[PDB]
Amino acid sequence: LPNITILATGGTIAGGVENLVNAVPQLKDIANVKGEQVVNIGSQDMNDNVWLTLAKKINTDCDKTDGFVITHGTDTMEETAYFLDLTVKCDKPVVMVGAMRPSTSMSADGPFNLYNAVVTAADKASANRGVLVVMNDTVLDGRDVTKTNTTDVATFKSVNYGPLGYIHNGKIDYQRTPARKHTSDTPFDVSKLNELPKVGIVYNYANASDLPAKALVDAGYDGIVSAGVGNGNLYKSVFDTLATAAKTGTAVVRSSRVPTGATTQDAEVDDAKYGFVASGTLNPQKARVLLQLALTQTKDPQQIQQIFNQY
Amino acid sequence: LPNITILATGGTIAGVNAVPQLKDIANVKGEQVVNIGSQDMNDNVWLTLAKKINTDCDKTDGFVITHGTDTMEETAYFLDLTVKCDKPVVMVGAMRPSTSMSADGPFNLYNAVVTAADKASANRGVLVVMNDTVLDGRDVTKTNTTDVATFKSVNYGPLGYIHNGKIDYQRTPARKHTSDTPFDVSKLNELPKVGIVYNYANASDLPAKALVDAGYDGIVSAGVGNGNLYKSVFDTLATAAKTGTAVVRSSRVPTGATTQDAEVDDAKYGFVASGTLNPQKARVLLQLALTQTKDPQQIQQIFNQY
Amino acid sequence: LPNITILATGGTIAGVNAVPQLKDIANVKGEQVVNIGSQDMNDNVWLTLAKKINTDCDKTDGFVITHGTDTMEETAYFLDLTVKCDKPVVMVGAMRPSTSMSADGPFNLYNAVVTAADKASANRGVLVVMNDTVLDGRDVTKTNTTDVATFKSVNYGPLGYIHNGKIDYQRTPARKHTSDTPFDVSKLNELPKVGIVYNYANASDLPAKALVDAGYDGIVSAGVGNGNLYKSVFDTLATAAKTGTAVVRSSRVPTGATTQDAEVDDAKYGFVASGTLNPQKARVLLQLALTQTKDPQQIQQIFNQY
Amino acid sequence: LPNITILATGGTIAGGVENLVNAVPQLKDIANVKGEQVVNIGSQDMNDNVWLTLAKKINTDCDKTDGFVITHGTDTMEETAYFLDLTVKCDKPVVMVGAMRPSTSMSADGPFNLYNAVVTAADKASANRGVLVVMNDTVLDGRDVTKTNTTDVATFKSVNYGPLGYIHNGKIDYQRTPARKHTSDTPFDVSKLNELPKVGIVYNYANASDLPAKALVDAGYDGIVSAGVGNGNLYKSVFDTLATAAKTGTAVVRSSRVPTGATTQDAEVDDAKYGFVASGTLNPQKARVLLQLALTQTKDPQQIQQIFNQY
Ligand SMILES: N[C@@H](CCC(=O)O)C(=O)O
Ligand SMILES: N[C@@H](CCC(=O)O)C(=O)O
Ligand SMILES: N[C@@H](CCC(=O)O)C(=O)O
Ligand SMILES: N[C@@H](CCC(=O)O)C(=O)O
């Protein structure tokens, strides 16, 4: 049986971290499980320090186990998954899992999610697919997966390109793998980093104030992600502030508040004229992840656009 | 044939000579209210449309409002709450340029006029008609950045579908709209200041602080999950709510309700949960709620009724 | 607390001792009507349920019908048309075995009892409650073979969502149901014979012929696209319709309506278009239509009202 | 500019077949287009003869062009696409396209669909992805694509595993390719075949008659696909008839009328006991396609199951 390490970041999702083999006994039949509690927070409080800790821990311990399961709150699991997708250099399976119902509730989903997460982490076919999220019997790639519903146990979906595989009776039929470069195919190396560039997100809507953008500019933010309207469009005053900021060296990425589809280039905004970058299918919080990492290598917008075209 | 007024707010989405077939279904008159891209939509345009519709209700049988798609879902809900005409009011746009191949404008406008001319469309609130489907202004949202099929009432579904100029309506919104709401903008020249802040890992409190520092009347949080807030943002909005600012917890998550009685003790902090209203829609209702009350309990009641 | 009757048609989906929390929301009494897998569901079970509900309506405050998921969408629509009790009638099942990890039965049953106990659930027709969502028996269908979230009202959306034992109902079906329909099965021991044939490339006419040869009262076509038929199948159903057999064009396509006035001249052939009713649901209504009429125009009217 | 051949099977979808460069002039700017009318039928009348004609024509003419666009009715395009996905041996791009609105209607979708189909057929990156369906700005693989709505121009979706790529401004960001074996990676060779094994489809529902199944058995059908309920389940009398048939050498595949998800093995039906095959995510009409082709190589159910696990 394979050795699987569970890295916990929050409360339990089934039934300390060493107690999960008791909570979900069937795990014994599929893996030799060891648990470590990395942090214990709600994922609404996820932050750069925990991301760096997780990436370094996985990269350091890669040789000591056959795969990783990370238990994580669902609120920001899609952010952590993509960060790790880009910074983990272990090509053994790394699988994130959470639960939408409390472990104490009727029909709690945590136990079967964890079982299926371990199944996936133990499946040799899961390797080299990047970091994965396993929720509701489905294997999802860390780039495209997103929380689509506030309460549904089926909330996590790779809205644009679909899941990689479905799990039935502890076996996975994989039919897809992400084409975008991940893990050891990216140049992002966080092994020595203590911090990440500062990147904030502003929202666009009718009559939007420019004060959120201005405040981030005034604080010297390295980059700003716009949750635009439609195909990445900006309310005039937010546009104005970000246009000025970009000329001063602020990296500016146009993403969209629209939950599916790509903020494309060659649409309504002349990105080359303004020094902006279009985020593609990356939603604002995912665009932030890649923008922070891009900024550890380049402040040049054309090179950042190239990064957003490859990863 | 019904008299239908088209109120234009942007460029043409088609091209009445553009769509001659309108003549077969209505007597169409057009007035250009403003001409802007809807990414620049604003309070002033909203007030103008609501007043124009309420003033001209008796002069026509229904209204079509051509509009850019980017913020159509916001305008539709504002009008859904403030229009007192219960004749059909229908919003429509195009996802492809009117000069492009397989432009969607022409048939979208046609079906929008069909809807506004249909007696059965009355009393259903303000409507959005896109891709052969009639959608209520409360639940409708733009779900994809480029798809002609982008508009969907994601939580409760559409009211009806249009085939060959006929609508089979099977649903009507139960939340109170138009003449069933207390919001009256007839005499207002401005709306309370309400902004939106986004939550995400490591979120800065600076957007929230800047709105507070500017004396905003309300702040809508685009929370994570079921309305949750990053600690720094939580800290600032908790202070705002005890300091005069209405705080509504919505969610960046595209479907489902920011519920009461989850992880945030809204009663303790003075917060309001937005239900299925997404951030930009929650903003619409909060602004209007603030024209009537600043009490968080009374705003929650508004968010439970409209 | 309301008196709620649970009518079981299969094995347990949970395990009242199984779900003790029911005691907090209702006084639950259980009767096992049949015990079968719903892939074996049949006319006799349908008649029994409709009669039992109509007879015992006055003795209880609402009903939950535990049921296998495979044909739940069929039974729900039959009861939606034939139940004359307008107290809540709620159907529920489980997509995972009650002994498996994270079994969905227990919370599904709990929410089903919540729904049947909610005064606001009355007069909405027969309901299916699955994955925290209240769905009308007409539009609800099983959309995925294994997902706990499989049940969706794909065309018009759900009626309400359930959070913490509370439902926010925002919709109700406009099509006529329960006591608003003329279908009365109180005195019937059998239903007209109606079968379903599938269309696909190179489709054999032999399934259709076999139903005709057996004297079937009606045939539902699971057409391609908007109700279209493979030539051989067309030829046989055209003959059937002129020879005593009611023919309803539905579609294998999982969402959207088989419309009148598309590629098939239904008036010429004596056919009926099923609207948004999929094949198995179209069968339900056609059987009931046939207890009242054989006239294709009158059956089309039924398919436009129910 | 690449040479693209348009094989028409039905009426025009834009604006004879040689007239399409006039109907959609912008095609001139992206390809040298030549059209041939293979048949002219509505796709509700699609049949084995047209499938064989198309596969042989593409395999024969592969060296004479840079890619193929097949114009086809939408009703059965998902069947033809999968048949060709399994029998075309040209790994140059083969793209199917149709229109949901008549060419004469307001906002007809045919013209832009054809343009995008040619874009896809001309994109070198489209090669080696199997046979494709391009509809509503989306590139879909021929195995998973299905018509989900009776009238919506956005009807075609790869419901289980998602699209391969999206098209914006005549360029495609491909992020996925089908893992299941297609085209030159399958053993199905129709070059010499004049007919296909007879395979019919029966539907399951409450109180379902066994007469449709019996009739196909009595006619000596080589195989029967069950559009089962739920996870491939059968009404008792249909079950009985198909169980008997399988013991007599009839190939029996359990698919499902449920529009998404896989008819799995190891669920409610003991397929090994009965000699049945589970169709996986193949819906009934797609299962028919693979079953017919399997039957040109084997009547053994375990080998057919293996085929349904690989293709
Ligand atoms: N806010 C909690 C919700 C619980 C959960 O879904 O994990 C978290 O994200 O950690
Ligand atoms: N930004 C444009 C998009 C095009 C349109 O929808 O008309 C607008 O929303 O006005
Ligand atoms: N074939 C079973 C599936 C399990 C269930 O839904 O209870 C049935 O429909 O009865
Ligand atoms: N029955 C026609 C419909 C037209 C179409 O959508 O192509 C066909 O499939 O050919």
Side-chain angles (χ1 to χ4, degrees), chain B residues 245-266:
Chain B
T245 301
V247 173
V248 167
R249 294 194 299 109
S250 178
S251 169
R252 68 190 200 179
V253 178
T255 74
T258 283
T259 61
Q260 316 166 65
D261 301 323
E263 259 178 282
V264 185
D265 185 346
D266 286 311

mmCIF file of all heavy atoms in Angstrom, chain B residues 245-266:
data_model
loop_
_atom_site.group_PDB
_atom_site.id
_atom_site.type_symbol
_atom_site.label_atom_id
_atom_site.label_comp_id
_atom_site.label_asym_id
_atom_site.label_seq_id
_atom_site.Cartn_x
_atom_site.Cartn_y
_atom_site.Cartn_z
ATOM 1 N N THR B 245 -21.860 52.893 8.773
ATOM 2 C CA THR B 245 -21.831 52.344 7.425
ATOM 3 C C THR B 245 -22.611 51.037 7.402
ATOM 4 O O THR B 245 -22.384 50.163 8.234
ATOM 5 C CB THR B 245 -20.383 52.155 6.982
ATOM 6 O OG1 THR B 245 -19.717 53.426 7.020
ATOM 7 C CG2 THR B 245 -20.295 51.631 5.549
ATOM 8 N N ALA B 246 -23.541 50.924 6.465
ATOM 9 C CA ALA B 246 -24.271 49.685 6.243
ATOM 10 C C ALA B 246 -23.332 48.717 5.531
ATOM 11 O O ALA B 246 -22.652 49.103 4.567
ATOM 12 C CB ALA B 246 -25.535 49.957 5.414
ATOM 13 N N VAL B 247 -23.280 47.472 6.013
ATOM 14 C CA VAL B 247 -22.415 46.428 5.448
ATOM 15 C C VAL B 247 -23.284 45.254 5.033
ATOM 16 O O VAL B 247 -23.979 44.662 5.864
ATOM 17 C CB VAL B 247 -21.337 45.958 6.443
ATOM 18 C CG1 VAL B 247 -20.532 44.742 5.899
ATOM 19 C CG2 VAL B 247 -20.396 47.146 6.802
ATOM 20 N N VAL B 248 -23.233 44.901 3.747
ATOM 21 C CA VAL B 248 -23.942 43.733 3.220
ATOM 22 C C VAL B 248 -22.901 42.704 2.784
ATOM 23 O O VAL B 248 -21.968 43.041 2.055
ATOM 24 C CB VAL B 248 -24.877 44.112 2.061
ATOM 25 C CG1 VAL B 248 -25.356 42.832 1.299
ATOM 26 C CG2 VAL B 248 -26.064 44.912 2.605
ATOM 27 N N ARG B 249 -23.010 41.492 3.316
ATOM 28 C CA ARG B 249 -22.171 40.372 2.939
ATOM 29 C C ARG B 249 -22.836 39.719 1.729
ATOM 30 O O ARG B 249 -23.909 39.121 1.859
ATOM 31 C CB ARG B 249 -22.059 39.357 4.069
ATOM 32 C CG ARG B 249 -21.316 39.843 5.367
ATOM 33 C CD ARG B 249 -20.949 38.681 6.284
ATOM 34 N NE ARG B 249 -22.155 37.968 6.721
ATOM 35 C CZ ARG B 249 -22.496 36.752 6.301
ATOM 36 N NH1 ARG B 249 -21.715 36.062 5.467
ATOM 37 N NH2 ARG B 249 -23.624 36.203 6.752
ATOM 38 N N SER B 250 -22.184 39.807 0.589
ATOM 39 C CA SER B 250 -22.538 38.991 -0.574
ATOM 40 C C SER B 250 -21.366 38.022 -0.813
ATOM 41 O O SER B 250 -20.506 37.823 0.067
ATOM 42 C CB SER B 250 -22.837 39.910 -1.749
ATOM 43 O OG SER B 250 -23.140 39.145 -2.934
ATOM 44 N N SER B 251 -21.285 37.450 -2.012
ATOM 45 C CA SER B 251 -20.225 36.487 -2.267
ATOM 46 C C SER B 251 -19.726 36.584 -3.703
ATOM 47 O O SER B 251 -20.516 36.823 -4.637
ATOM 48 C CB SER B 251 -20.717 35.072 -1.991
ATOM 49 O OG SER B 251 -19.744 34.158 -2.492
ATOM 50 N N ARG B 252 -18.419 36.365 -3.882
ATOM 51 C CA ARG B 252 -17.852 36.318 -5.215
ATOM 52 C C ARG B 252 -18.294 35.058 -5.921
ATOM 53 O O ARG B 252 -18.088 34.970 -7.137
ATOM 54 C CB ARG B 252 -16.325 36.324 -5.158
ATOM 55 C CG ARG B 252 -15.808 35.060 -4.565
ATOM 56 C CD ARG B 252 -14.260 35.208 -4.298
ATOM 57 N NE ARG B 252 -13.622 33.911 -4.168
ATOM 58 C CZ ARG B 252 -12.324 33.754 -3.953
ATOM 59 N NH1 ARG B 252 -11.509 34.797 -3.862
ATOM 60 N NH2 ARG B 252 -11.843 32.529 -3.783
ATOM 61 N N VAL B 253 -18.823 34.083 -5.172
ATOM 62 C CA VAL B 253 -19.212 32.789 -5.757
ATOM 63 C C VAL B 253 -20.431 33.020 -6.631
ATOM 64 O O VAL B 253 -21.373 33.683 -6.168
ATOM 65 C CB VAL B 253 -19.513 31.783 -4.662
ATOM 66 C CG1 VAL B 253 -19.976 30.447 -5.202
ATOM 67 C CG2 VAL B 253 -18.190 31.583 -3.761
ATOM 68 N N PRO B 254 -20.467 32.506 -7.871
ATOM 69 C CA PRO B 254 -21.454 33.006 -8.843
ATOM 70 C C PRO B 254 -22.890 32.520 -8.645
ATOM 71 O O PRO B 254 -23.807 33.108 -9.247
ATOM 72 C CB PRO B 254 -20.888 32.534 -10.196
ATOM 73 C CG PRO B 254 -19.991 31.343 -9.899
ATOM 74 C CD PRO B 254 -19.393 31.699 -8.514
ATOM 75 N N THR B 255 -23.138 31.496 -7.830
ATOM 76 C CA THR B 255 -24.496 31.017 -7.632
ATOM 77 C C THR B 255 -24.691 30.659 -6.178
ATOM 78 O O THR B 255 -23.740 30.356 -5.473
ATOM 79 C CB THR B 255 -24.840 29.764 -8.491
ATOM 80 O OG1 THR B 255 -24.195 28.597 -7.961
ATOM 81 C CG2 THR B 255 -24.410 29.985 -9.946
ATOM 82 N N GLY B 256 -25.938 30.705 -5.739
ATOM 83 C CA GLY B 256 -26.268 30.336 -4.382
ATOM 84 C C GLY B 256 -26.343 31.543 -3.452
ATOM 85 O O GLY B 256 -25.851 32.632 -3.743
ATOM 86 N N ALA B 257 -26.950 31.359 -2.257
ATOM 87 C CA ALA B 257 -27.174 32.474 -1.315
ATOM 88 C C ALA B 257 -26.162 32.751 -0.216
ATOM 89 O O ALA B 257 -25.655 31.807 0.383
ATOM 90 C CB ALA B 257 -28.519 32.267 -0.629
ATOM 91 N N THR B 258 -25.860 34.024 0.062
ATOM 92 C CA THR B 258 -25.033 34.354 1.221
ATOM 93 C C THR B 258 -26.118 34.233 2.284
ATOM 94 O O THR B 258 -26.988 35.092 2.304
ATOM 95 C CB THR B 258 -24.399 35.755 1.212
ATOM 96 O OG1 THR B 258 -23.274 35.749 0.331
ATOM 97 C CG2 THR B 258 -23.900 36.125 2.619
ATOM 98 N N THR B 259 -26.090 33.216 3.159
ATOM 99 C CA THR B 259 -27.177 32.977 4.090
ATOM 100 C C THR B 259 -26.918 33.631 5.452
ATOM 101 O O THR B 259 -25.781 33.881 5.860
ATOM 102 C CB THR B 259 -27.405 31.482 4.327
ATOM 103 O OG1 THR B 259 -26.228 30.901 4.892
ATOM 104 C CG2 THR B 259 -27.752 30.704 2.998
ATOM 105 N N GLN B 260 -28.009 33.895 6.159
ATOM 106 C CA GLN B 260 -27.905 34.158 7.589
ATOM 107 C C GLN B 260 -27.617 32.843 8.306
ATOM 108 O O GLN B 260 -27.840 31.757 7.766
ATOM 109 C CB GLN B 260 -29.198 34.795 8.108
ATOM 110 C CG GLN B 260 -29.726 35.868 7.206
ATOM 111 C CD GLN B 260 -31.152 36.245 7.540
ATOM 112 O OE1 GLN B 260 -31.414 36.770 8.604
ATOM 113 N NE2 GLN B 260 -32.074 35.985 6.623
ATOM 114 N N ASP B 261 -27.106 32.930 9.521
ATOM 115 C CA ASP B 261 -26.904 31.733 10.343
ATOM 116 C C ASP B 261 -25.917 30.750 9.699
ATOM 117 O O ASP B 261 -26.150 29.537 9.653
ATOM 118 C CB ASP B 261 -28.244 31.028 10.621
ATOM 119 C CG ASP B 261 -29.262 31.917 11.358
ATOM 120 O OD1 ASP B 261 -28.865 32.715 12.240
ATOM 121 O OD2 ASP B 261 -30.472 31.811 11.036
ATOM 122 N N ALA B 262 -24.803 31.279 9.193
ATOM 123 C CA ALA B 262 -23.678 30.426 8.815
ATOM 124 C C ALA B 262 -22.511 30.760 9.746
ATOM 125 O O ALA B 262 -22.653 30.686 10.980
ATOM 126 C CB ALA B 262 -23.302 30.606 7.338
ATOM 127 N N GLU B 263 -21.361 31.151 9.170
ATOM 128 C CA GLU B 263 -20.170 31.377 9.981
ATOM 129 C C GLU B 263 -20.063 32.779 10.561
ATOM 130 O O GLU B 263 -19.268 32.993 11.481
ATOM 131 C CB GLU B 263 -18.911 31.141 9.159
ATOM 132 C CG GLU B 263 -18.256 29.831 9.372
ATOM 133 C CD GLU B 263 -17.047 29.683 8.480
ATOM 134 O OE1 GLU B 263 -17.274 29.407 7.302
ATOM 135 O OE2 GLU B 263 -15.921 29.916 8.956
ATOM 136 N N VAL B 264 -20.767 33.754 10.015
ATOM 137 C CA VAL B 264 -20.703 35.125 10.493
ATOM 138 C C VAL B 264 -21.933 35.386 11.358
ATOM 139 O O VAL B 264 -23.064 35.100 10.949
ATOM 140 C CB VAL B 264 -20.610 36.133 9.333
ATOM 141 C CG1 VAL B 264 -20.428 37.559 9.857
ATOM 142 C CG2 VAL B 264 -19.462 35.749 8.367
ATOM 143 N N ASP B 265 -21.708 35.923 12.557
ATOM 144 C CA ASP B 265 -22.797 36.337 13.449
ATOM 145 C C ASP B 265 -23.219 37.738 13.058
ATOM 146 O O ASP B 265 -22.770 38.735 13.653
ATOM 147 C CB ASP B 265 -22.337 36.315 14.904
ATOM 148 C CG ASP B 265 -23.457 36.610 15.906
ATOM 149 O OD1 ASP B 265 -24.560 37.085 15.551
ATOM 150 O OD2 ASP B 265 -23.189 36.334 17.085
ATOM 151 N N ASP B 266 -24.135 37.822 12.095
ATOM 152 C CA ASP B 266 -24.487 39.123 11.529
ATOM 153 C C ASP B 266 -25.108 40.045 12.572
ATOM 154 O O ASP B 266 -24.956 41.268 12.486
ATOM 155 C CB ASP B 266 -25.465 38.950 10.387
ATOM 156 C CG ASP B 266 -24.795 38.382 9.098
ATOM 157 O OD1 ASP B 266 -23.737 38.903 8.687
ATOM 158 O OD2 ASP B 266 -25.325 37.401 8.546
#
